[PDB]
Structures are given as structure tokens and as C-alpha cells.
Amino acid sequence: RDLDSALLAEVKDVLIPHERVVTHSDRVIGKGHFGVVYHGEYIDQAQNRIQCAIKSLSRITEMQQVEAFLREGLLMRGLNHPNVLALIGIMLPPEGLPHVLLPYMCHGDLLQFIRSPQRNPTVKDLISFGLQVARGMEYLAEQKFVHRDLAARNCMLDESFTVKVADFGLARDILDREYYSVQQHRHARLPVKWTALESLQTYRFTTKSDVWSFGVLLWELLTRGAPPYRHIDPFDLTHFLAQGRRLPQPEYCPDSLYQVMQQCWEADPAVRPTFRVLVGEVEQIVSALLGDHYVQLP
Numbered sequence: 662r663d664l665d666s667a668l669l670a671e672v673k674d675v676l677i678p679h680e681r682v683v684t685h686s687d688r689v690i691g692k693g694h695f696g697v698v699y700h701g702e703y704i705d706q707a708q709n710r711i712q713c714a715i716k717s718l719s720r721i722t723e724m725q726q727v728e729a730f731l732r733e734g735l736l737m738r739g740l741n742h743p744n745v746l747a748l749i750g751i752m753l754p755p756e757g758l759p760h761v762l763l764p765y766m767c768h769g770d771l772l773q774f775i776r777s778p779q780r781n782p783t784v785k786d787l788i789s790f791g792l793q794v795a796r797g798m799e800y801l802a803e804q805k806f807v808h809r810d811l812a813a814r815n816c817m818l819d820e821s822f823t824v825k826v827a828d829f830g831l832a833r834d835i836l837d838r839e840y841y842s843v844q845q846h847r848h849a850r851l852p853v854k855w856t857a858l859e860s861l862q863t864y865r866f867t868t869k870s871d872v873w874s875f876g877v878l879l880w881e882l883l884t885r886g887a888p889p890y891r892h893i894d895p896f897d898l899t900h901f902l903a904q905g906r907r908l909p910q911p912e913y914c915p916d917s918l919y920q921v922m923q924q925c926w927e928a929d930p931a932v933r934p935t936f937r938v939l940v941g942e943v944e945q946i947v948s949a950l951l952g953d954h955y956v957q958l959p
């Protein structure tokens with residue numbers, strides 16, 4: 662189960678040798694759809710030791726998929742934006758699965774931030790976070806990356822509460838259909854309810870299906886973390902959306918933003934706006950707000 666020397670050379674700029682990395686397998690941060698995240702440490706190029714997070718991927722086993730992942734890793738390694746979480750690199754233990762090294766984000770994820778009873782976010786605070794997500798997504802789209810798993814939980818917060826979009830480059834067209842399937846009814850996975858109607862049908866994802874996901878993300882923000890479509894069996898979800906029903910306008914969501922959400926969820930992907938346009942629209946909404954309300958927990 663070893664890589665071709667040629668591959669190893671091709672993807673050298675993203676591989677970190679296992680002997681430059683410690684995974685604290687007893688310091689588990691949490692487990693998700695696509696692997697387990699641990700505290701860890703690696704040695705940089707200056708020979709300094711850096712604390713980080715390390716995610717061992719559970720769904721990448723076949724060698725063709727491992728190779729595909731590393732080549733995609735090499736692309737991601739070159740991504741650089743304030744609102745996008747850096748990929749430090751990838752590590753292959755001699756026998757075992759690909760590990761992704763990520764900057765440790767000390768303030769956790771947006772979903773937990775907004776759900777914290779110890780905080781009192783305003784509407785304007787919440788839309789401002791949304792704008793930061795839009796900016797990260799605009800950059801990813803420009804770089805020809807489709808997230809496939811965009812949601813408030815995958816927007817991380819650093820020491821200065823800068824939002825970093827994370828966990829792109831993991832889910833794939835077709836291969837990961839299990840996480841997007843509705844045939845398990847109330848055993849279906851979280852991503853179903855963030856996924857564009859057409860992608861529920863085909864397991865093919867585009868930037869326009871990410872735009873749909875972003876609409877649901879905005880709805881999360883302005884409900885401070887309500888579960889989308891709480892009372893709908895996922896089995897009925899495609900039918901609900903095909904009738905043209907959508908998430909309802911949150912109590913303190915301005916009409917201008919609800920309109921953007923509605924654009925994001927147009928049934929025709931071509932009609933949905935680009936992230937570039939969303940950035941502009943959301944920026945305009947922020948600047949044109951009148952007054953400000955606290956927002957309650959759901």
C-alpha cells in the first residue's frame with residue numbers, strides 16, 4: 662500500500678513526512694462526516710515545532726482515491742485568503758490513512774459561537790459573519806473549488822474572530838452519496854438539509870449548489886443555529902422543495918437579506934447569484950442597516 666515514487670515527487674510540495682508530525686491520538690477534538698480531528702504538532706521548515714489540528718480521513722481508502730486526494734491537496738496547498746482555512750499539508754503514516762494538517766482555530770466554529778448562551782449577538786454582528794463567509798467562498802469559487810459541505814459548523818474562528826471557511830476538498834461528486842442520501846429518512850446525515858435540490862438528485866455539486874448551501878448558512882446565522890427543516894422527514898424534503906417551499910424568514914432577518922436567501926434557493930442554478938455578486942449585495946445590506954436588534958436563541 663505504498664505510493665509510486667513518481668507521485669510522491671509530483672505532490673512533494675504538500676506531503677509532510679510522518680516523522681515530522683505528532684498526532685495526540687488521546688486528545689480528540691471531535692469526529693465528523695469525513696474523519697476524526699485531533700490535537701497535534703509538526704516541525705516547520707525553520708525546525709520550530711507548531712501546534713495544529715490533524716484530521717485523519719476515514720473515507721479515502723482505495724489507492725486511486727488516495728492519489729486523487731493528494732493531487733487535489735496539492736491544489737489546495739496554494740490557496741491563500743483571509744477567510745479560507747489554510748492547508749498546512751498532508752501526512753501518510755506508513756500503514757494507514759491520509760491525515761490533513763490544519764491551523765488550530767482557538768475559537769471553534771460559527772455554529773457554536775452563535776449558540777453560546779454567554780453571548781448576545783446582534784443582527785448586524787450575524788450578517789457581518791455571513792459577509793466573511795461569502796468572501797471566503799468567492800475566493801474558492803474563483804479558484805475552481807466546490808465546497809460540497811458548506812454549513813455554519815465548517816466556518817472556523819481564529820484568535821481575532823476572523824471566519825475561516827474549512828472542510829472543502831473532502832466530499833466528492835458521487836463517491837460520498839451516503840452523506841447526501843434521503844433514503845435513510847430520519848437516519849439521513851446533516852448535509853442533506855444544506856444541499857441544493859439538483860445535487861440531492863445527482864450527487865453532482867457546483868459553485869451554484871454551494872450558493873444554495875450559503876443561503877441555508879445565512880438562515881442558520883439569523884436564527885442563531887436553528888436546525889433547518891426541523892419537522893420535515895428528509896424523505897419528504899425533495900418534494901417540499903419541488904413544491905417551492907423554503908425555509909421561513911427568521912424573526913429579525915431584514916427583508917433585503919431574506920430576498921438574498923431566496924435567490925440562493927432558486928430551483929434553477931443558473932438564476933442563483935455568484936458569490937461575487939453575493940459579496941456585493943451583503944456588503945450593501947450591512948451598510949444600509951437601520952437600528953440593530955439582539956437575536957434570541959431558538
Ligand SMILES: Nc1ncnc2c1ncn2[C@@H]1O[C@H](COP(=O)(O)OP(=O)(O)NP(=O)(O)O)[C@@H](O)[C@H]1O
Nearest residue numbers: 690691692693694695698714763764765766770828
Ligand atoms: N482546525 C481546527 N481547529 C480546531 N478545531 C477544529 C478544527 N477543524 C475541526 N475542528 C473541530 O473538530 C471537530 C470535528 O470536526 P469535523 O470532523 O470537521 O466535524 P463537523 O465540523 O462537526 N462536521 P463536518 O465537517 O461536516 O464533517 C469539530 O468540533 C470541529 O469544530
Ligand SMILES: [Mg+2]
Nearest residue numbers: 693814815828
Ligand atoms: Mg467540519
